[PDB]
Design a protein around this ligand. Structure first.
Ligand SMILES: Nc1ncnc2c1ncn2[C@@H]1O[C@H](COP(=O)(O)OP(=O)(O)OP(=O)(O)O)[C@@H](O)[C@H]1O
Ligand SMILES: Nc1ncnc2c1ncn2[C@@H]1O[C@H](COP(=O)(O)OP(=O)(O)OP(=O)(O)O)[C@@H](O)[C@H]1O
Ligand SMILES: [Mg+2]
Ligand SMILES: [Mg+2]
Ligand SMILES: [Zn+2]
Lengths: 204, 190, 175, 649, 437
DNA sequence: AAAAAAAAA
């Protein structure tokens, strides 16, 4: 029996649709590890049942055909439950890494879900270590290239940009940008991409 | 680049970039001949054309540099030969008289057209609306021919001699997947 | 065939008719009273994920423990209907994993008469898929949505990808 | 020109490829020849072809038939007639019967695809195309003969002349119209006398069919289309019968295109020429292993409880009500005597109870599971129109009777809700019918006795809002005693408040509402579907797939599926007619005497009718176990059921 | 004569092929997307036509019934130009394209229509009360003679022809012709009845009815009881069968229809409104933002508004393999003291619901609610006519003064609301009818 | 010929 496992897989598909329709890493859902641990306890029951069945089979009272068929059925049950659980976990890890890579490896606790408490603790430490790996990777031979930058090809050199949030004045190369609330800048494209990604600017 | 399924095909902006990384002709409005002054000394394009440049003469530069000079008053782009009414007329006649072969056109088709119509508006010797309408008619008939030819989807191969970049890009995810499914069905049946 | 593919693992859960060609005492404990053995030639609706292997192990006259009956999904009626008019037929009512299930079935059983009919099926439906994908609004009648609600689950990704590609092309073209 | 010959020879090749139709033609020929001159059924010259084979043979001819039947059907029937004329061998024929020249018109079956439509879906772009329409018969016309070819004779010439007439509705292809003027003079003036017995006449009937009300758009009324059919199948089915009619949908008539139009807003006339008819019934035959299953299950000791529990599994309680319903659906045999006139054969059940006790739901279940039944409500019916109505025919201009609510339900069962709320006047109709199972109409010069042997089940609520246990049963029921005495069984149902039963029924009902249709997810509502893939439809004994019936395991006792129960009742109502013996007679008379002289309070008074009810119930229970004789156990169970229905446990 | 027609056709074709705003030829792409989905029609907006050139609009407004067919054949000429290949020289199953118009001109009330509006384009609004069954019309007639017996074809337009006199060139009759029904082309036509809106009726008068005719794609688009906006031609047709002298009954030829419901009730919504609805559903206080929105002019009632919202959403319909039905609606009864604003909530509930009817329990009858058995005086046949509880199927019915309703009338609704189906048996008509509300 | 609304007994 593995029908419970199906309820997981179908649910995962909905999550994929959330990834597809939005085309943006945002509001990842809250885990379903309760059903997972229910499956774990029932498969532990299955495993102990297999161990006892092997015990009677070695005893000699049990019939060989019954033992072998029950062994195959139980092995298939474990295989399918493991398949469902790994199908869930692989998609979870994929979406985790996809949202982790694009925000410069900082996880942006200053602004995406706020407390990221809908993730499991194991998933949270995985996210932290992946951020560590991303920070480490661009510290090698690619120090002169920002990998986590934009991927839209550079089409124009001078653009108009409109401020979205108020701040003080920010130092730049040979200049200073005072972010007065609700103002428009006519500046270089290669100077405000970091601010635009952070959400402090608008109207590219 | 992952972004979901954006790792399999090219986005239109990438197509625009790869097209604009191509040579083009230019008539400069200024002079930068060396005194017989800062060196251009670029890495991915010959400087000797840019540095040894004199006004009102023909020279070849990359498209993005031409656009950058066109933003100021330092440029005058020369339109290609195929962007005129007398060439598009014979082209459309060729498509009309030949109902199976795609006419020969540069693979930058519709893309150089879009860029030139957007930016280089005041340098054309012909009205813009007429050229735009004729290009639309060309696109229309080529679309009809592509739709007619798409009916044959063999599991072995296919031939498309003279399709432009955008036409191939917008059709790849459908044709590729359908042919892959047919191949899988055939292979699983043997 | 992908282990971490969600559509495949969903499709593996469909139920197929089967026959116990070989008697096994003490079985059926997951379906009826455990103390009652299941007699010979007793029919159940077993899922694919165990029917594929349980009918091939044999165990031992190395006859398999179970025998798999021809499912009603692949029947003469459906073949006649699909051969008559495939464009107006709604496969979504028959199944949601029709194509993957058909591929699995034809891989298990070599039948040179299903591959050509199914090939002509999806080849004919691909043209209307392209026709609907190329129709971008500038909201629409009943025909297009009626067709879209007849589609198979595996055709939805093709339809969506084509629609997004055409939409991106139009968005770039008109600025 | 030569296209007719090409199509004829192509159809001849197709008939040569498939050898089944030739065998059918040979069989029909030999059967007719055997019926001719050996010490009344005659097979009509019609054959059914499966166009799936035609598609598998020649796609072009198949598409030509399915798109433009006008240019394709006539060559096919001509080729069939020629093949019949070559195959047959009658060296000594008759004179009048040899001139029939029946073209052997065809019938079709198989997959249609986009041509299996509904009366609402028929539009302009489906004209001149072979189609199949599903629906319910609403009304029919009269069978009137019409002429085709007249035979004329003149005494002097000795040569018999013949003239052929064709109309717009007679043939698929439009030809030059011909008037009905009898030719009475020859070219040389010889007097011609019309020769009856040599001319050709064919029956004619027009019927109308409408879309089923269930599959209709919200806030829309059902729509109707009209069907013309002649020759064979001329008097098949009746009003109130689900049909699937295959034929050609064509327009006819000038439709005001001539000068006769009074306004520009004129529409043409559309009409379908039926080729064949099939009964839907949402099939009705039984197999050998079906008989084996029925017999082996009837040999069980507890068949009646299993069958009773098999009715409406979602209704909690009401066990004896289910048993009475089972006995009613397959009630006792009718008795007729040369001196004793008529004896009633079925059983009627009446239920009265406080609101929300599952009476209408059980009645709806009985309607769904019955072979033939009609739904009726007390307030929305009128007794005059419930039995027979007088309406004028549009074609002939005369007035003819129309069958009422229960005349259509002859030999069926009629279910009535809000029985007490019906107007008192209309009740007399029931008083007329349930008395002798015959309704007599005498109005506007029509004198006829119509047969109606239906059984009536009714449910009514008491006069007060809730039943009063402390009150007289007579004053709790608004109906008069005259009609109450006719009903065999009176059942009273009350929802006594009890926490244990409340918990049980609550968990049962909550179990019912947590149900999901197979193969469909729970996030979206139920959506409509299309028809079956086939327009016309159609290892042994080792499967028991739908025999045992225990689809899901929730209890130790068995349960059987509904279609097998319908098969069982169909078999029982026909194959078994039991007889009673003296052993059951002793029990019947003893329990009647004991019940009559017990002298304690009872819900209803008893009389000689109750003993006749006991006899009918004993016969019904002798039928339920598939035995030809009545056992005393049937008498005991009938007595127990009556004692419950009259006293209570 | 023919030169002017060619000039007009050329003008309209130039308009179609040359109209562009910014960088898009809207009408050509519209034709492409219509042909791809098999919707042979085109929509023209008045403002674009006026902005392009004023002479074409002047000619269209002068004599519409003579000019429109020229435009509708120019459309199909352009469609054949831009949809098929010459191939140096077939199916050609493209009929004459349908033309649909939209406008924003000043509305004209029904009672304001008079003799000066004959053969003019008018825009007006009303309520649909009855829809006729569709009928067939001939467009391409194949005609056969009887004596000379040759073939001929007749093409018929729907705007604004009889058997030709004499034969085509021996000595045939006046009109020796018959109609060959096979190899003929037919279309669909439908009739509708329109009634004045209640708020625009003049003082001390009664509503007036009017007759409209639609054809092809415009048919089967509206249902009775829905407010609509119609643009069409107000013309007159004589009645030979039918007082006075030289009388002519007027009617309307439908060209364009706008409806508030937009025939939405499968999903017809595009992506923008879909994502807007999803974002609204993500609001964590949507229950309160909906409760506050139920009649913001009524103060104090909160549980009543919550009950009304719950009723408006409706339950979940359920079916079983055993065949039994489960109801999927909830019924709310307001039973209280006068002055507590009960009817003012009833009219607002009528307004909000997509399908709703408001009626009084006093002026009502059992036969006037479920189904009335009318009888056609001409053909003398019985047929069912819908009442008020069948018009509100799939919606909500508003009943006030429920206690003033007669006892005999109040009993017919029992089965209609407990089983959602009504059964009738009158004059031999045995029909079970569904009513879910 | 049959259904449905209205005033008076
Ligand atoms: N024993 C029962 N098991 C399941 N459902 C029940 C039972 N008794 C009553 N019900 C429920 O009661 C509801 C009332 O249904 P319904 O109106 O048909 O009943 P009724 O007793 O015939 O009522 P009425 O006298 O008002 O016509 C139904 O939804 C039905 O499911
Ligand atoms: N809570 C309220 N807030 C504002 N206005 C109210 C409120 N209750 C009643 N009214 C006012 O009462 C007036 C009359 O109300 P209405 O006639 O609808 O009362 P009702 O309770 O439905 O009466 P009835 O029982 O006699 O039919 C309206 O003009 C309305 O503004
Ligand atoms: Mg009830
Ligand atoms: Mg009020
Ligand atoms: Zn002639």
């Amino acid at each position: 029996y593995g029908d419970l496992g199906n309820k997981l897989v179908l649910e995962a598909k909905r999550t994929k649709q959330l990834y597809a329709r939005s085309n943006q890493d945002v509001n990842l859902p809250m885990y379903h590890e309760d059903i997972i641990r229910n499956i774990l306890k029932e498969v532990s029951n299955l495993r102990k049942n297999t161990e006892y069945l092997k015990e009677q089979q070695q005893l000699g009272m049990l019939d060989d055909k019954v033992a072998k068929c029950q062994y195959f059925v139980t092995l298939l049950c474990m295989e399918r439950n493991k398949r469902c659980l790994l199908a869930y976990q692989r998609l979870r890890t994929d979406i985790l890494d996809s949202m982790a890579w694009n925000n410069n490896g900082l996880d942006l606790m200053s602004s995406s879900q706020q407390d990221t408490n809908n993730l499991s603790h194991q998933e949270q430490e995985y996210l932290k270590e992946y951020c560590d790996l991303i920070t480490d990777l661009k510290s090698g031979d690619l120090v002169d290239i920002d990998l986590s930058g934009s991927l839209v090809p550079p089409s124009d050199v001078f653009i108009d940009v409109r401020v979205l949030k108020d701040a003080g004045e920010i130092q730049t190369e040979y200049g200073v940008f005072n972010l007065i609330k609700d103002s428009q800048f006519f500046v270089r494209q290669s100077d405000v991409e970091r601010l635009i990604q952070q959400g402090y600017l608008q109207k590219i | 680049s992952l972004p979901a399924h954006l790792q399999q095909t090219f986005s239109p902006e990438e197509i625009q970039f790869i097209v604009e990384n191509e040579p083009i002709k230019i008539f400069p409005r200024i002079t930068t001949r060396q005194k017989i002054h800062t060196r251009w000394q670029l890495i991915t394009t010959d400087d000797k054309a840019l540095n040894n440049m004199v006004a009102m003469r023909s020279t070849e530069v990359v498209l993005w540099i031409a656009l950058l000079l066109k933003q100021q008053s330092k440029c005058s782009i020369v339109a290609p030969q195929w962007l005129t009414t007398k060439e598009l007329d014979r082209k459309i006649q060729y498509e009309k008289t030949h109902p199976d072969r795609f006419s020969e056109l540069p693979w930058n088709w519709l893309v150089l057209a879009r860029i030139l119509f957007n930016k280089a508006k005041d340098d054309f010797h012909d009205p813009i609306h007429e050229l735009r309408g004729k290009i639309q008619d060309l696109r229309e008939i080529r679309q009809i021919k592509v739709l007619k030819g798409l009916k044959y989807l063999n599991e072995s191969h296919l031939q498309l001699d003279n399709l432009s970049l955008l036409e191939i890009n917008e059709l790849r995810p459908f044709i590729t997947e359908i042919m892959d499914k047919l191949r899988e069905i055939h292979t699983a049946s043997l | 065939m992908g282990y971490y593919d969600i559509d495949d693992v969903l499709a593996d859960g469909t139920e197929f008719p089967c026959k116990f060609q070989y008697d096994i005492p003490g079985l059926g404990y997951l379906e009826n009273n455990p103390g009652r053995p299941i007699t010979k030639n007793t029919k159940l609706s077993l899922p694919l994920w165990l029917a594929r292997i349980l009918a091939i192990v044999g165990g031992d006259e190395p006859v398999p423990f179970v025998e798999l009956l021809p499912p009603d999904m692949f029947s003469t009626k459906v073949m006649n209907a699909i051969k008559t008019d495939p464009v107006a037929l709604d496969l979504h009512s028959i199944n949601s994993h029709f194509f993957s299930l058909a591929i699995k079935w034809i891989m298990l059983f070599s039948e040179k008469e299903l591959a050509n009919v199914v090939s002509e099926l999806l080849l004919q439906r691909a043209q209307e898929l392209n026709h609907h994908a190329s129709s971008l609004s500038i909201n629409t009648n009943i025909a297009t949505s009626t067709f879209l609600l007849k589609l198979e689950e595996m055709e939805k990704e093709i339809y969506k990808k084509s629609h997004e590609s055409y939409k991106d092309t139009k968005r770039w073209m008109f600025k | 020109d030569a296209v007719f010959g090409d199509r004829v020879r192509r159809f001849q090749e197709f008939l040569d490829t498939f050898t089944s139709y030739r065998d059918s033609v040979r069989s029909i020929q030999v059967y007719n020849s055997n019926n001719a001159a050996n010490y009344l059924n005659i097979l009509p010259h019609r054959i059914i072809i499966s166009l799936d084979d035609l598609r598998e043979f020649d796609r072009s001819f198949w598409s030509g038939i399915l798109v433009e039947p006008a240019y394709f059907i006539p060559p096919a029937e001509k080729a069939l007639t020629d093949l019949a004329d070559s195959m047959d061998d009658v060296p000594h024929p008759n004179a009048s019967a040899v001139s029939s020249r029946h073209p052997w018109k065809l019938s079709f079956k198989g997959s249609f695809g986009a041509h299996a439509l509904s009366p609402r879906t028929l539009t302009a772009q489906h004209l001149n195309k072979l189609v199949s329409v599903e629906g319910i018969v609403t009304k029919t016309s009269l069978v009137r003969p019409k002429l085709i070819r007249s035979v004329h004779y003149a005494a002097k010439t000795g040569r018999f002349h013949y003239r052929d007439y064709t109309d717009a509705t007679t043939t698929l292809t439009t030809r030059i119209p011909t008037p009905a003027i009898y030719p009475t003079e020859d070219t040389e003036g010889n007097k011609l006398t019309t020769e009856y017995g040599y001319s050709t006449f064919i029956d004619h009937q027009r019927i109308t069919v409408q879309e089923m009300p269930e599959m209709a758009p919200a806030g829309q009324l059902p729509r109707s289309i009209d069907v013309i059919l002649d020759d064979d199948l001329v008097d098949k089915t009746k009003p109130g019968d689900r049909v699937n009619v295959v034929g050609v949908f064509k327009s006819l008539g000038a439709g005001g295109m001539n000068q006769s139009n009074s306004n520009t807003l004129i529409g043409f006339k559309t009409l379908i020429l039926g080729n064949t008819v099939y009964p839907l019934h949402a099939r009705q035959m039984l197999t050998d292993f079906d008989i084996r299953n029925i017999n082996k299950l009837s040999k069980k000791k507890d068949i009646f409880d299993i069958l009773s529990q098999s009715l409406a599994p979602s209704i909690y309680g009401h066990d004896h009500i289910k048993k009475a319903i089972l006995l009613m659906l397959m009630g006792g045999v009718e008795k007729n005597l040369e001196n004793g006139s008529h004896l009633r054969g079925d059983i009627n059940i009446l239920m009265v109870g406080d609101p929300s006790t599952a009476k209408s739901q059980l009645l709806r279940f009985v309607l769904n599971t019955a072979s033939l039944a009609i739904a009726t409500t007390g307030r929305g019916s009128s007794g005059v129109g419930l039995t027979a109505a007088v309406t004028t025919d549009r074609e002939t201009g005369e007035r003819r009777l129309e069958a009422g609510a229960m005349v259509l339900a002859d030999r069926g069962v009629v279910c009535i809700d809000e029985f007490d709320k019906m107007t008192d006047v209309d009740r007399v109709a029931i008083h007329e019918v349930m008395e002798q199972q015959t309704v007599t109409i005498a109005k506007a010069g029509i004198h006829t006795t119509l047969n109606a042997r239906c059984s009536v089940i009714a449910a009514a609520n008491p006069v007060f809002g809730q039943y009063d246990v402390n009150r007289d049963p007579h004053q709790n029921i608004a109906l008069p005693d005259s009609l109450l005495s006719r009903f065999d069984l009176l059942f009273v149902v009350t929802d006594d408040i009890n926490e244990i039963r409340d918990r049980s029924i609550s968990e049962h009902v909550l179990r019912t509402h947590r149900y999901l249709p197979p193969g469909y997810l729970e996030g979206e509502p139920v959506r409509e579907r299309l028809n079956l893939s086939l327009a016309v439809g159609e290892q042994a004994g080792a499967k028991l797939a739908k025999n045992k019936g225990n689809y899901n395991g929730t209890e130790i006792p068995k349960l059987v599926t509904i279609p097998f129960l319908r098969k069982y009742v169909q078999y029982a109502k026909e194959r078994v007619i039991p007889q009673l013996t003296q052993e059951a007679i002793n029990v019947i008379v003893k329990n009647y005497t004991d019940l009559r002289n017990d002298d304690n309070t009872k819900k209803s008074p008893i009389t000689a009718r109750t003993l006749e009810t006991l006899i009918r119930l004993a016969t019904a229970h002798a039928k339920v176990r598939l035995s030809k004789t009545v056992n005393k156990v049937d008498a005991k169970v009938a007595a127990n059921l009556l004692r419950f229905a009259l006293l209570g446990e | 004569n023919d030169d002017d027609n060619t000039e007009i056709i050329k003008s309209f074709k130039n308009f179609i092929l040359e109209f562009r705003l910014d960088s898009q030829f809207i009408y050509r792409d519209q034709l492409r997307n219509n042909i791809l989905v098999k919707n042979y029609s085109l929509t023209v907006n008045m403002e674009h036509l006026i902005g392009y050139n004023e002479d074409i609009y002047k000619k269209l407004s002068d004599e519409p019934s003579d000019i429109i067919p020229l435009f509708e054949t120019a459309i199909t000429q352009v469609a054949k130009r831009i949809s098929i290949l010459s191939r140096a020289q077939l199916l050609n199953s493209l009929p004459t394209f349908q033309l649909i118009l939209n406008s924003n001109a000043n509305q004209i009330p029904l009672r304001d229509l008079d003799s000066e509006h004959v053969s003019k384009i008018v825009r007006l609004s009303g309520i649909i009360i009855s829809t006729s069954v569709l009928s067939s019309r001939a467009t391409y007639l194949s005609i056969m003679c009887r004596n000379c017996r040759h073939t001929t074809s007749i093409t018929i337009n729907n705007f604004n022809v009889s058997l030709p006199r004499s034969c085509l060139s021996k000595n045939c009759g006046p009109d020796p012709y018959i109609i060959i029904h096979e190899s003929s082309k037919f279309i669909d036509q439908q009739f509708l009845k329109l009634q004045e809106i209640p708020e625009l009726v003049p003082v001390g008068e009664m509503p007036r009815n009017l007759t409209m005719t639609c054809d092809r794609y415009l048919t089967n688009k509206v249902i009775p009881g829905t407010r609509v906006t119609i643009v069409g031609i107000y013309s007159i047709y004589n009645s030979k069968n039918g007082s006075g002298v030289a009388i002519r009954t007027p009617y309307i030829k439908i060209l364009g229809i706008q409806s508030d419901v937009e025939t939405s009730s499968v999903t017809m919504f595009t992506e923008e409104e879909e994502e807007e609805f999803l974002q609204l559903s993500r609001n964590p206080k949507l229950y309160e933002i909906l409760t506050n929105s139920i009649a913001p002019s009524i103060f104090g009632n909160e549980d009543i508004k919550k009950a009304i919202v719950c009723l408006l959403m409706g339950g979940s319909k359920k079916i079983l393999p055993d065949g039994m039905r489960l109801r999927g609606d909830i019924n709310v009864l307001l039973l209280g003291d006068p002055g507590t604003a009960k009817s003012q909530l009833l009219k607002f509930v009528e307004k909000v619901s997509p399908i709703a009817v408001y009626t009084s329990g006093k002026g009502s009858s059992a036969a006037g609610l479920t189904a009335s058995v009318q009888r056609d005086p001409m053909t003398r046949e019985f047929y069912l006519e819908g009442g008020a509880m069948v018009l509100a199927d799939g919606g909500v019915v508003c009943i006030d003064e429920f206690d003033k309703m007669r006892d005999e009338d109040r009993v017919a609704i029992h089965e209609a609301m407990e089983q959602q189906t009504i059964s009738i048996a009158k004059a031999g008509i045995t029909t079970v009818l569904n009513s879910r509300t």
